[PDB]
Amino acid sequence: CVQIIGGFFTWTPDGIPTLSNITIRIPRGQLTMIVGQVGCGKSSLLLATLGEMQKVSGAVFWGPVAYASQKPWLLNATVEENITFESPFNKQRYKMVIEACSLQPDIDILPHGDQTQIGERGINLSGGQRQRISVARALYQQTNVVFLDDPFSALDVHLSDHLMQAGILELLRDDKRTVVLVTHKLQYLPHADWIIAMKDGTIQREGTLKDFQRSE
Numbered sequence: 001c002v003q004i005i006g007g008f009f010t011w012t013p014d015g016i017p018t019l020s021n022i023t024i025r026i027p028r029g030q031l032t033m034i035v036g037q038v039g040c041g042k043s044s045l046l047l048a049t050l051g052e053m054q055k056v057s058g059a060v061f062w063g064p065v066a067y068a069s070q071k072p073w074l075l076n077a078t079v080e081e082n083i084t085f086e087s088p089f090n091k092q093r094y095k096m097v098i099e100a101c102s103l104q105p106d107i108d109i110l111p112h113g114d115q116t117q118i119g120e121r122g123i124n125l126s127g128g129q130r131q132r133i134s135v136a137r138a139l140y141q142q143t144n145v146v147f148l149d150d151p152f153s154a155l156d157v158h159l160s161d162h163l164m165q166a167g168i169l170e171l172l173r174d175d176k177r178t179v180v181l182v183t184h185k186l187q188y189l190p191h192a193d194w195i196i197a198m199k200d201g202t203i204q205r206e207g208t209l210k211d212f213q214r215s216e
């Protein structure tokens, strides 16, 4: 599991802290949503769980962890390359990830059916395509933990439903990975195990769905 006790850090060598008194357990094989308002330390907590931000006074334990950031990024290479990301290619695995991301038709829409040279930052692609490619990169890698920083911001309702069904609840939940996804929707609340509510950089309440509905 991913254990955190006494969260405390900020974005400076000295200054007022934004991370304050966070204690969270992320057990294996469990969907964990993080919900809250705009500016409640969701992605900050994501990067702190990563070890990206060495906290001032606190303990954090859990490694190579797959992670798709909020702002999508690409390489100066092909689509297959960005989705493989220096990994030995697979037939069934890669085709599964391609189909489960609702990406094969739009991939075939491009001027080059595949191995198309993705431009610098993705000028000849749209935001939703970049996001789907990032989510495919995150899902395709073989690892224990996956983070997805709101992968449903530039997607429709149909594509988001198909992604959360085929790629998340059927493919991620298949191999029993520790999926930690942060977003704000309705369909995903009853599909997770632990609900995490954040307010002003503090965990307001914590627990499961029933422990959240039986509390204030």
Ligand SMILES: Nc1ncnc2c1ncn2[C@@H]1O[C@H](COP(=O)(O)OP(=O)(O)OP(O)(O)=S)[C@@H](O)[C@H]1O
Binding pocket: 011, 018, 037, 038, 039, 040, 041, 042, 043, 044, 045, 070, 150
């Ligand atoms: N890379 C960074 N460097 C310095 N400051 C940052 C950085 N990222 C975020 N911040 C600051 O940290 C504060 C909180 O940022 P976030 O944690 O990303 O907000 P959030 O609502 O919890 O998650 P979002 O909005 O979905 S990314 C913001 O006010 C930023 O000014």
